[PDB]
Amino acid sequence: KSSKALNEAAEQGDLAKVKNLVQKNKIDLNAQDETGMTPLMNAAMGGNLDIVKFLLSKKVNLELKNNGGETALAFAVTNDAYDVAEELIKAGANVDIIVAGDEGDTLFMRAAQNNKKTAESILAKNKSLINKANTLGETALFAVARYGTPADIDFLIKKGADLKLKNKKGQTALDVAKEASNQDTAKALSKKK
Amino acid sequence: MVYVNSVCHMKAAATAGKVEGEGDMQKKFPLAAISKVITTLWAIEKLGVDYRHKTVLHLTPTANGSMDLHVEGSRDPIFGRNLSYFLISELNRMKVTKIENLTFDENFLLDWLAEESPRIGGVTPRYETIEQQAEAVIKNLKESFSTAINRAMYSKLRERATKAKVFMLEKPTIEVRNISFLPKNNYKKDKYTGSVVLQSAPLRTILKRMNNQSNNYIADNLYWNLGGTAAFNAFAAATLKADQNQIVFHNGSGNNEGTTAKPIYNEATCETMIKTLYTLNKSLEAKGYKLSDVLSVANKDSDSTIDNFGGNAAGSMIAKTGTVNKAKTLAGSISTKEGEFYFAILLHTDMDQSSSDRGVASQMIKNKISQLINKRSGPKEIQYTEILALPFDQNSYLTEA
């Protein structure tokens, strides 16, 4: 039996109300609601590091998934709560996971577009994630080639990204940069070898 | 489900010219917190960009050597913990450590957690009567203003003040014996009343703080302070050339005014958001400011909701985000090699179907912004230094009335 009031309090950052409801001791903190959501997921989604740390002190399950297939770590990353992502990684959250959406983006991919530090923390657990492709055969290098910067490109080249990988349509990162009209990443990639 | 309601963009120029995008630019959609962009314009138009909330403190000596204090309020919408800590420091500088009778009038707003969760994202408390407002101000004064100062928090605030070149004492205290409401109608001062004024930060910085955080408390109280819905509609007609066909507001924040099951949201057309942005920018330029003085800058404002808006927008986008159960929104400008461009992007979501919709919508918006940048020959980094947005500055020290 999950608690609506607790889940909402976690999402919204009302630490006082969370501690208050958890103190009465009625609530199983691993109980998932009608869409698979846990208090930990709500806390992570809302970027509330205080509530995450409190919930982690109760030794909640890190690897439960909502209906969208996402763990708390995924909720943190996808909603730009990278301070929460770091806490969850230090707590032992699995980083070799998929975030929601049609593409099957890796957690590393989503972090690589947005927060360099968490991208590094992920790779520190598993170096090969640099070149792990999503469902369309694309890696981080493809995403940032479309929508990122030369600085992103070299960050990934330095972590061992493979320039010559093709997606399921037979395109390289360089090809998708050009198709996206990102002249900056196109130039950076086409000078590289 | 996640999908595009509407997208607009327009080049930033002397004139509001060609607009392109996706969907119906003239259909009202839920705004979520891009509502705050409009609230921001309205505040600046009515109050002036550098307006200061001037709270007046009426200090009268008691026979025991303490002070009585009457607070004459300015309806300051960022008066909470931080501004309280600063006021306590200030009182001690003036040799006031003990208050006998603390009274306050109908304009003194105090919510301890004004700049903190859950006030940032919560439903802002709405006081129907003055009594209810008074009792809540009493509660804060009694429980927070008068209790032992949180040493760790005071010290974090002071570390920031010091970066901002504002002086605060290391270790000030205050004691308050009695606290009660006293309307402005009924306050008259003794022969020996000396009175001093606390100016909060200039409005533009209060707005920068609100927009960074998406602070509902600050936005909702600005809206009430400016006159609420009736006053808002007159503003929208005159400034935005807009009536209920283009825009309907219920609050300053864009937050849900209804239920989880039956939500009610501020709505406007995508066109209306472009107008807002153009007019807000003109206003600020006329006073020597820029859009970045009130709205967040991608990546460069660390303490903001677009701290981690990566991609080619980093350091090249000024924007406000929005998030409600039914919408994910963004509005602002992008700086590119072909100039600056206003934009508004409105997406539908359904958290009730899946909470994963928020994350999906977030990366769609980011990729859309990147695409718009690509098509305008890439980013051009903006001239900007991170504003440290405190509720007080070097002209906030107590001065004679």
Residue numbers in the entry:
A (entry chain B): 28 to 220
B (entry chain A): 26 to 426
Paper lines:
The use by B. bacteriovorus (and related periplasmic predators) of multiple DD-endopeptidases to decrosslink prey wall, and our observation of specific neutralization of Bd3459 by Bd3460 raised the question as to whether a similar mechanism is used to protect against Bd0816. Bd0816 expression was toxic but was circumvented by mutating the active site Serine residue to Alanine (S58A). The resulting 2.48 Å structure of the Bd0816:Bd3460 complex reveals a conserved mode of binding between the ARP self-protection protein and both predatory DD-endopeptidase targets. In-vitro characterization of the Bd0816:Bd3460 complex suggests the 1:1 heterodimer likely represents the dominant form in solution.
Previously, we assigned prey cell rounding to the action of two secreted Bdellovibrio peptidoglycan DD-endopeptidases, Bd0816 and Bd3459, that act to modify the invaded cell wall via hydrolysis of the structural 3-4 peptide crosslinks. In summary, we conclude that we have identified and characterized the first ever self-protection protein encoded by predatory bacteria—ankyrin repeat protein Bd3460 from Bdellovibrio inhibits the prey wall decrosslinking enzymes Bd3459/Bd0816 and in doing so protects the predator from the shape transition that this catalyses in prey.
